[PDB]
Amino acid sequence: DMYIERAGDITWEKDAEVTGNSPRLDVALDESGDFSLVE
């Protein structure tokens, strides 16, 4: 049995850690909601 606890406000924070790349990926989405790489 499952419960929720508040964790913060939803706000854009100026000067947050900038990181991560921006890949363009060919993908398929199946009936079960699972993404896969089309190669």
């Binding site: 419960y3 929720i4 947050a16 850690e17 900038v18 890949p23 990926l25 909601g33």
Partner: protein, 156 residues
């Protein structure tokens, strides 16, 4: 129960200790998370009960107490922030320029940030603080690293 707008942890006590299974967003009295987090089960907020209202295993989304409310969209250009909420760790904004999932049905924003499974449902925001989708459904790439779709629902 707690109905204040913001981001929330989704916890279970059905395993060892109190385990975070995911994350979600409270907006306009509706709780928004990913389907694989709850499997469509009821939630507690203190004494208050939260019952499912809408869900879709293919979109991997679910809303509680009312219809999906979040309708902002990635503009296709600007950087975004993942308001990551990892298990046991404070809420933390991570700014990134999304990549792209190219599918037969269209292109979707994707964010290449790796976090534990329990981070599923953490919101992705635009510069105006609007939630443009949730983190936690995506794909493992050549490297072994995770790319999440920016998953958004439709608002009726």
């Amino acid at each position: 129960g707690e109905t204040t707008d913001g981001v929330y942890r989704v916890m279970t006590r059905r395993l060892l200790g109190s385990t975070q299974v995911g994350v979600g967003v409270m907006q306009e009295g509706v709780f928004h998370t990913m389907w694989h987090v709850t499997k469509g089960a009821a939630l507690r907020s203190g004494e208050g009960r939260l019952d499912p209202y809408w869900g879709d295993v293919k979109q991997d989304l679910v809303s509680y107490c009312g219809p999906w409310k979040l309708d902002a969209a990635w503009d296709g250009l600007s950087e975004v922030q993942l308001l990551a909420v990892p298990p046991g760790e404070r809420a933390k904004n991570i700014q990134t320029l999304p990549g792209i999932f190219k599918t037969k049905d269209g292109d979707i924003g994707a964010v290449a940030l790796d976090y534990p499974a329990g981070t599923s449902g953490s919101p992705i925001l635009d510069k105006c603080g609007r939630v443009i989708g949730l983190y936690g459904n995506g794909v493992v790439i050549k490297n072994g690293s995770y790319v999440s779709a920016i998953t958004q629902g439709k608002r009726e």
